Each structure stands twice: as C-alpha cells, then as structure tokens.
Amino acid sequence: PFGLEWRRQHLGKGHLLLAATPGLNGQMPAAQEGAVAFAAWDDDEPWGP
Amino acid sequence: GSHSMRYFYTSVSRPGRGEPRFISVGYVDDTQFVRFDSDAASPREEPRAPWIEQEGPEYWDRNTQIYKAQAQTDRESLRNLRGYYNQSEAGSHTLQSMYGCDVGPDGRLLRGHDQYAYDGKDYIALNEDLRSWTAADTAAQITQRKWEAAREAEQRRAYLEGECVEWLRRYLENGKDKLERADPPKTHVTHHPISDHEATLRCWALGFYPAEITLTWQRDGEDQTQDTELVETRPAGDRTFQKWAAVVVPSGEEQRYTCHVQHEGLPKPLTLRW
Amino acid sequence: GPAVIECWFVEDASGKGLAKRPGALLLRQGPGEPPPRPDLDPELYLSVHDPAGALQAAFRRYPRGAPAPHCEMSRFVPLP
Amino acid sequence: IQRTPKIQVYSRHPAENGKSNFLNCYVSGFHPSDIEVDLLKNGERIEKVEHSDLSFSKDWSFYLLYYTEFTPTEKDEYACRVNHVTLSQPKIVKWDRDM
Ligand SMILES: *[C@@H]1O[C@H](CO)[C@@H](O)[C@H](O)[C@H]1NC(C)=O
Numbered sequence: 398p399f400g401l402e403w404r405r406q407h408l409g410k411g412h413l414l415l416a417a418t419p420g421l422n423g424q425m426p427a428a429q430e431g432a433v434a435f436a437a438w439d440d441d442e443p444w445g446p
Numbered sequence: 447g448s449h450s451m452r453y454f455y456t457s458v459s460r461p462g463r464g465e466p467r468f469i470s471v472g473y474v475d476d477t478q479f480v481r482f483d484s485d486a487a488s489p490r491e492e493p494r495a496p497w498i499e500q501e502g503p504e505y506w507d508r509n510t511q512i513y514k515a516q517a518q519t520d521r522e523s524l525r526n527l528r529g530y531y532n533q534s535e536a537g538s539h540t541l542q543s544m545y546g547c548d549v550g551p552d553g554r555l556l557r558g559h560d561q562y563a564y565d566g567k568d569y570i571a572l573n574e575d576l577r578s579w580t581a582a583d584t585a586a587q588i589t590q591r592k593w594e595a596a597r598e599a600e601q602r603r604a605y606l607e608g609e610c611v612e613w614l615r616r617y618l619e620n621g622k623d624k625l626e627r628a629d630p631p632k633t634h635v636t637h638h639p640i641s642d643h644e645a646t647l648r649c650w651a652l653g654f655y656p657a658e659i660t661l662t663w664q665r666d667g668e669d670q671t672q673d674t675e676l677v678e679t680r681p682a683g684d685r686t687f688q689k690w691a692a693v694v695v696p697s698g699e700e701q702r703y704t705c706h707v708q709h710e711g712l713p714k715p716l717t718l719r720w
Numbered sequence: 721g722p723a724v725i726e727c728w729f730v731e732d733a734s735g736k737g738l739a740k741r742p743g744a745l746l747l748r749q750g751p752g753e754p755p756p757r758p759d760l761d762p763e764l765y766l767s768v769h770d771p772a773g774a775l776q777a778a779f780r781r782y783p784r785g786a787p788a789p790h791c792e793m794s795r796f797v798p799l800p
Numbered sequence: 801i802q803r804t805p806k807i808q809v810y811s812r813h814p815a816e817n818g819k820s821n822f823l824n825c826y827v828s829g830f831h832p833s834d835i836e837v838d839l840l841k842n843g844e845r846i847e848k849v850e851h852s853d854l855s856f857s858k859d860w861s862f863y864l865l866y867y868t869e870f871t872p873t874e875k876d877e878y879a880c881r882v883n884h885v886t887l888s889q890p891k892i893v894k895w896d897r898d899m
Binding site for chain 3: 525527529530584585587588591592594595667
C-alpha cells in the first residue's frame with residue numbers, strides 16, 4: 398500500500414487538494430474542489446517492480 | 447492477348463459419407479481441357495478440349511495415377527490441417543492448390559503462381575519474385591521454412607518458366623480457332639423511364655470473346671464514374687460473354703450521354719448514343 | 721497481466737504431422753523456484769528473460785478479465 | 801471463411817416473345833462448393849435443367865451455370881432459387897428481360 402498526496406501552493410496559500418492510500422482502508426481528508434485521482438497500482442502481481 | 451494456364455486441385459472432406467472427394471482441372475484462358483473426378487464412375491483424367499495434344503492412352507493412365515497419388519496426399523493434408531486447427535471430425539473442410547503461368551501476347555512469362563488455401567483462406571503462396579513465400583499461420587510457416595531449406599522455389603520457378611510456358615504455347619497454337627479468336631461485341635442502348643423526371647440508359651454488349659471488355663458512360667465527353675451501375679461479365683452459354691452498364695439521367699438530357707465500348711474485337715472503341 | 725502463458729509446441733519435423741504438445745511461458749520468474757509443472761515437458765516450460773522488455777511490457781498491461789491469448793511455439797533455424 | 805453465392809438470371813439472347821431461347825442462372829463466388837440451384841417458372845420447378853461442371857476461380861471460390869430451353873412470353877415469370885450454407889432461407893432472384 399502507498400499514499401498519494403496532491404497539494405497546491407500559490408501566493409502564500411496552500412491546500413491539501415487530495416489524499417489517498419490505495420491498498421489500505423482508512424479515513425482520508427475530503428477531496429477539495431471536486432477533484433479525483435486515478436491512484437492505483439497497474440497490476441497486483443506478487444513480485445515487483 | 448494475355449493468356450494463362452492454371453491447374454486446380456480441390457479435396458473436399460465428406461464426413462460420414464466416404465472419403466474426401468478430389469477434383470483436378472486444367473484451364474487455358476478459363477477454358478477447361480482436362481478433368482479428374484474421384485466421384486466419376488471410372489476415375490480417369492479425361493480431355494475436355496479437342497485442341498489438346500493427345501499422346502495415347504498410356505499418358506492418360508499415367509496422369510490418372512498421378513492424380514490418384516495427389517488425392518491420397520490431399521487426404522493426408524486434410525487430416526493434418528483438421529487436427530492442427532482443432533476442428534471437429536463432423537464438419538466439412540476443403541483444401542485447394544493452384545499452380546500455373548500467365549503469358550503475354552508475345553509468349554513471354556509474366557506471373558507464375560503456386561498457392562495453397564484451406565477452407566477458402568490463403569494458406570501459403572509463392573510470391574511474385576518466385577523466391578519467397580507468404581505464410582500467416584504457424585503450420586504454414588513450418589512448411590515455408592521446410593521449403594526454403596529445401597530450395598523448392600528453385601524447382602518451381604524452373605518449371606513455371608519452362609514446361610509451363612512451352613505447354614501453354616503448344617495449346618494456344620493447337621487452338622487458334624477458339625483460344626486465339628476475338629468476337630467483337632454487339633452493342634445497343636436501351637431507355638427505361640424510372641421516374642417522372644429521370645430515366646435509365648443501359649448499354650448492352652453481347653456475344654463478345656474473350657471476357658475482357660470495358661464499358662464507360664461519359665456525359666459531355668467526360669467520364670461519368672459517379673453512379674454508374676455495372677454487372678459482372680457473365681457467360682452467354684455458347685462460349686461468348688454478356689455485360690451491361692447502366693446510368694441514371696435527367697429526362698430530356700439523354701442526348702448528352704455516350705456509351706464507350708473497348709474490346710479486342712473492335713478495331714476502334716465504339717461510341718453509342720441513344 | 722498473466723504470470724504464465726499456456727502455449728502449444730508444434731512439431732516441425734516431417735512425418736509428425738503438426739502434433740501439438742503442451743508448454744508454458746513463465747514471463748516473470750520472481751524470487752524463489754518457479755511453479756512446479758510436472759505435467760509439462762521440461763523443455764517446453766520456459767522462464768522468459770526479456771532484456772528489451774517488449775514482451776514483458778506487452779503482457780504487463782494486458783486487460784483484466786480478458787480471454788487467454790493463443791500461443792504457439794515452434795523450432796526455428798536461422799536462414800537468410 | 802464462407803462466401804455467399806452471387807446470382808444472375810438472364811437469357812442467352814435478347815428475349816423475343818414466341819422465340820426459343822435459353823434461360824441462364826449464373827451462380828458465382830461461393831464457398832464451400834455445396835449449393836442448390838433451381839429454375840422456377842411461375843414458382844414451379846423446371847424439370848429439364850442442365851448445368852456445367854463445377855468450376856474453380858483463382859480466388860478459391862466456385863461457380864456454376866444452369867441453363868434451360870424456354871420460349872419467353874408475357875404472363876410467364878421466371879426466377880432462380882438458390883440455397884447455400886450461408887443463406888438462412890433460399891434466395892429467389894427474378895428474371896427481367898432488361899437485366
Ligand atoms: C481445442 O478446443 C477445445 C475447446 O476450447 C479445448 O478444450 C482444447 O484444449 C483444444 N485443443 C487444442 C489441441 O488446442
């Protein structure tokens with residue numbers, strides 16, 4: 398499992414637009430501005446990369 | 447003009463109805479001159495054209511034996527290909543082989559052919575260069591690599607450039623009366639009112655041999671390729687051919703349409719105006 | 721994508737017809753021994769190593785819930 | 801691969817009422833080679849119908865010609881009925897003196 402973070406910074410103003418933890422179930426902060434992410438592994442093979 | 451000689455072999459399996467049926471045919475310019483059929487009462491290669499070079503019953507018996515051997519080979523190949531393609535032993539499948547040579551008006555080779563198809567789809571064909579082969583399937587590629595290792599294209603090219611052309615020339619010389627004739631077409635234009643403001647002009651070319659003809663409608667002396675209906679050249683049933691080409695024209699403007707006919711029999715192209 | 725591709729080895733030798741034998745292509749060996757396949761002939765079970773990665777990348781994004789691809793092996797002799 | 805037959809129905813000569821002629825059904829470009837062909841006069845099947853040997857094209861298809869002697873006249877309809885493995889039901893193509 399991994400985490401994905403999308404933030405914005407501009408003119409001294411920052412927002413956590415999106416936080417996800419694909420592969421792990423938990424409560425993430427609500428996404429802002431109706432933003433979504435395609436956060437996933439491309440496959441679930443037992444061995445990396 | 448341009449003549450051809452083709453040999454076709456076709457084996458059609460008939461599950462639950464006996465062994466596969468084998469047919470072998472030879473054509474000069476789409477004119478049959480030999481035919482073997484296993485379903486025949488007395489399986490034997492039989493001439494079908496008086497212009498053939500008959501050489502005694504011994505040659506016919508030899509050809510009969512050759513075609514029986516080819517029948518056995520084609521049965522074996524049919525079973526092999528049915529097994530490879532994972533097909534049930536209940537359906538009917540066909541195996542076709544075609545080899546021959548095309549020759550120009552001067553009697554010089556143009557294109558040799560040696561192809562095999564399974565169920566009507568190309569299986570393996572000798573290319574125009576007469577050196578390589580085209581094979582799409584894995585079995586076709588196995589046989590292709592076998593032949594390339596064995597240098598079969600060399601022998602096939604030697605035959606196609608040699609005995610094939612010699613026999614084609616001999617047949618054409620023995621058959622000047624039919625194989626080398628040119629019947630000009632009989633042409634006429636018919637008018638059919640198809641609507642209150644449109645009609646159909648149909649140009650008929652009848653009784654022409656060979657089958658290579660060209661019919662073209664021109665409006666105001668220019669080609670009318672748009673909406674020009676055609677029918678495939680068809681046999682009249684007496685060694686000649688028929689064809690027609692139709693166009694749809696505004697009523698009262700038929701005077702500005704010309705049918706153009708090109709055929710070897712015609713010394714000059716014909717122009718028809720209804 | 722698939723970790724193993726089932727394949728049919730087609731016999732090149734004449735007189736064998738086109739007899740097919742089972743085989744497998746294990747694309748990614750992965751740490752540890754490969755999945756034992758006593759049913760397969762040891763010569764037709766192939767652990768594939770792809771330096772260029774065209775085959776691996778082709779079958780790493782293979783659509784999920786898709787029919788198994790049709791594979792066929794054969795013996796090859798380099799010719800001009 | 802399977803190909804449907806292509807059917808043409810015509811006469812050897814331009815039709816003239818009261819004049820003896822041949823009616824031809826030319827079937828071409830079908831695969832496999834098993835095909836049923838009948839010539840119909842007013843729906844009924846003509847008995848004495850001849851045909852040529854199965855022929856072979858360079859593109860792996862087959863063709864046949866079915867011919868029968870007839871005297872065209874008005875009020876008499878002629879058609880060709882063809883059945884092939886690629887046809888759900890037999891297809892009948894009508895004969896027109898100008899086609
Ligand atoms: C033939 O097809 C059947 C049905 O899918 C399959 O079970 C069988 O393994 C196939 N055989 C070969 C030799 O490919």
